[PDB]
Amino acid sequence: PNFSGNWKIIRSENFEELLKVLGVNVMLRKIAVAAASKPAVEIKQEGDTFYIKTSTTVRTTEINFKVGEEFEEQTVDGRPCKSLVKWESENKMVCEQKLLKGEGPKTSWTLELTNDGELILTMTADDVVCTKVYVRE
């Protein structure tokens, strides 16, 4: 299917705790779940090529990738990393991340589209999982 759209968050579970495994301090943490608490997600998909923009009130980031080709982005706590997305199924992609510098938690993310048109994002850091669910504006 097609992941394209302007996506608004409808559910968020365990985000604060993902931030703790990544070692995000309490100052940054409390404002990260506050007004940066509607991240808006915009996706443009063409075949295996993706543009994904994630925005809060104060921050904006863009990634551009093709499935099966390495690219650079950052972990949720901001550390630069090399990423690689592959399809787990027709409706689900999985991204493995590797730090460019230093050591840290094993981090990944997944995106999947339900038959009803919900976008499910999961983010993992070692043994901690955060799930966010979006619907199209």
UniProtKB/Swiss-Prot annotation:
GO terms for molecular function: cyclin binding; fatty acid binding; retinal binding; retinoic acid binding; retinoid binding; retinol binding. SUPFAM superfamilies: Lipocalins (SSF50814). Pfam families: Lipocalin. Gene3D superfamilies: 2.40.128.20. Its main location: cytoplasm. A motif (Nuclear localization signal) lies at residues 20-30. GO terms for cellular component: cytoplasm; cytosol; endoplasmic reticulum; extracellular exosome; nucleoplasm; nucleus. It is found in: Cytoplasm; Endoplasmic reticulum; Nucleus. All-trans-retinoate binds at residues 132-134. Sumoylated in response to retinoic acid binding, sumoylation is critical for dissociation from ER and subsequent nuclear translocation. Disulfide bonds: none annotated. Keywords: Cytoplasm, Endoplasmic reticulum, Isopeptide bond, Nucleus, Retinol-binding, Transport, Ubl conjugation, Vitamin A. GO terms for biological process: embryonic forelimb morphogenesis; epidermis development; fatty acid transport; positive regulation of collateral sprouting; regulation of DNA-templated transcription; retinoic acid metabolic process; signal transduction. Forms a beta-barrel structure that accommodates hydrophobic ligands in its interior. Belongs to the calycin superfamily. Fatty-acid binding protein (FABP) family. Interacts with RXR and RARA. Interacts with importin alpha. Transports retinoic acid to the nucleus. Regulates the access of retinoic acid to the nuclear retinoic acid receptors. This is Cellular retinoic acid-binding protein 2. It comes from Homo sapiens (Human). The lineage of its organism: Eukaryota, Metazoa, Chordata, Craniata, Vertebrata.
